[PDB]
Amino acid sequence: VTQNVLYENQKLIANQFNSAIGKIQDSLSSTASALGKLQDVVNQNAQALNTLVKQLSSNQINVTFLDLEYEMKKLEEAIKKLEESYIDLKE
Amino acid sequence: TQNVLYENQKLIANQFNSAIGKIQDSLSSTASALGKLQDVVNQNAQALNTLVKQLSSNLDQINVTFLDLEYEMKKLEEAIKKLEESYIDLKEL
Amino acid sequence: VTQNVLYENQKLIANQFNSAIGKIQDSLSSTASALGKLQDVVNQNAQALNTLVKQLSSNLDQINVTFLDLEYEMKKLEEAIKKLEESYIDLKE
Numbered sequence: 001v002t003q004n005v006l007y008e009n010q011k012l013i014a015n016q017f018n019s020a021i022g023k024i025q026d027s028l029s030s031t032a033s034a035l036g037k038l039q040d041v042v043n044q045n046a047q048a049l050n051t052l053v054k055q056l057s058s059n060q061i062n063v064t065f066l067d068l069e070y071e072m073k074k075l076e077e078a079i080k081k082l083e084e085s086y087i088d089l090k091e
Numbered sequence: 092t093q094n095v096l097y098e099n100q101k102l103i104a105n106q107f108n109s110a111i112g113k114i115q116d117s118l119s120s121t122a123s124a125l126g127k128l129q130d131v132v133n134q135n136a137q138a139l140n141t142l143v144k145q146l147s148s149n150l151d152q153i154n155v156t157f158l159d160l161e162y163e164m165k166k167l168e169e170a171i172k173k174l175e176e177s178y179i180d181l182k183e184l
Numbered sequence: 185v186t187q188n189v190l191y192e193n194q195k196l197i198a199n200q201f202n203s204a205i206g207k208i209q210d211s212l213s214s215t216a217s218a219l220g221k222l223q224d225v226v227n228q229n230a231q232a233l234n235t236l237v238k239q240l241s242s243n244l245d246q247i248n249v250t251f252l253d254l255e256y257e258m259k260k261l262e263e264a265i266k267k268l269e270e271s272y273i274d275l276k277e
Contacts, residue, residue, distance in 0.1 A: 001187060001188070001191065003092060003093070003096070003187065006096055006187065006190055006191065006194065007096065009194055009198075009275050010096065010099055010100070010103070010194070012273065012275070013103060013194070013197060013198060013201070013273055013275075014099075014103060016201070016271050016272070016273045017103070017106070017107065017110075017201060017271075019270070019271050020205060020268060020271040021110065023264050023267045023268050023271065024110075024114065024208065024264070024268075026260065026263075026264060027212055027260065027261055027264035028117055030256075030257045030260035030261060030264075031117075031121060031215060031257070031261070033257055034219055034254050034257035034258075035124050035128075037252060037253075037254060037257075038128060038222060038226070038252065038254070040250075041226055041230070041250050041251070041252040042128070042131060042132060042135070042226060044248070044249075044250045045135070045226070045229070045230050045233060045249055045250065046131075046135050048233060048237075048247050048248060048249050049135060049138060049139055049142070049233060051246065051247055052142075052233070052236075052237060052240075052244070052247050053142060055244065055246075055247075056146075056240070060141065060145065061138050061141055061142055061145075062134070062138060063134075063135060063138050064130075064131050064134045064135060064138075065131070066127060066128065066131040067127075068124045068127060068128075070120075071120040071121070071123055071124040071127075072124075074116065074117065074120040075117055075120060075121070078113050078114070078116060078117040081109075081113045082110060082113055082114075084109075085106050085107075085109050085110040085113065086106070087102060087103055087106045089099050089102070090095055090098065090099060091095060093185075093187065093190070096190055097185070097190060100190065100193055100194070100197070103197060104197065107197070107200070107201065107204075111204060114208065118211055121215060125218055125222075128222060132222070132225060132226060132229070135229070136225075136229050139229060139232060139233055139236070142236070143236065146236075146240075150239055152235075153232050153235055153236055153239075154228070154232060155229060155232050156224075156225050156228045156229060156232075157225070158221060158222065158225040159221075160218045160221060160222070162214075163214045163215070163217055163218035163221070164218070166210070166211070166214035167211055167214060167215070170207050170208070170210060170211035170214075173207045174204060174207055174208075177200045177201075177203055177204040177207070178200075179196070179197060179200055183193075183196065184189075184193050
């Protein structure tokens with residue numbers, strides 16, 4: 001019920017929130033990196049399968065490719081946007 | 092001071108809401124990426140299986156596996172929905 | 185506008201923040217699980233393709249199959265869950 005107690009709790013709240021921001025940023029960066037690796041490998045093996053198909057026909061099957069660039073960029077943008085969610089209290 | 096404490100409380104709420112929105116967006120794009128991954132991986136598993144089948148009717152130990160991420164994608168959508176309940180509306184203060 | 189309302193709002197804010205942190209930890213858990221499932225299926229279909237290429241080459245030098253290792257990213261997601269555990273707010277009397 002004291003102004004001092006309220007002020008201390010407020011600083012605690014802001015500091016814990018700010019601490020969470022950095023951790024969530026790292027998790028977003030690791031998720032984007034994992035998606036990039038997945039795209040690389042899936043497309044490489046799709047290309048191997050396609051090459052195998054046509055090299056076997058040199059002597060019906062639809063291979064598909066993956067594009068996750070937009071989602072990965074949205075994750076990077078979230079990282080930069082969260083940079084702007086930090087709390088800077090007055091006083 | 093009472094004034095400044097209240098302004099800080101509202102700043103805290105606004106920053107928190109903006110972070111929640113950005114995190115919801117990130118979760119949406121992760122679920123969308125996961126769905127695309129499932130579609131493409133299963134389509135190429137089908138292609139490999141069809142190649143095996145057409146090769147054996149012209150070995151039977153080649154095992155193709157398929158992916159089901161739909162429980163995880165639904166959990167990401169649920170997280171979005173639940174974070175929607177964590178918003179603090181200024182009228183709540 | 186009144187210190188008692190400020191105190192109540194402070195408790196409301198802290199509880200919504202803690203609940204959001206829990207939801208975010210859950211989303212990270214389900215993302216790590218989806219990533220592990222993806223690695224399993226992608227590598228199993230890679231090995232299936234490689235086995236097919238070898239059995240046809242013993243029946244193709246240019247065909248390269250690659251494998252996926254997401255272990256660093258998955259450990260970093262588990263790490264984010266663990267660190268976020270230290271971000272909870274314990275207000276007191």
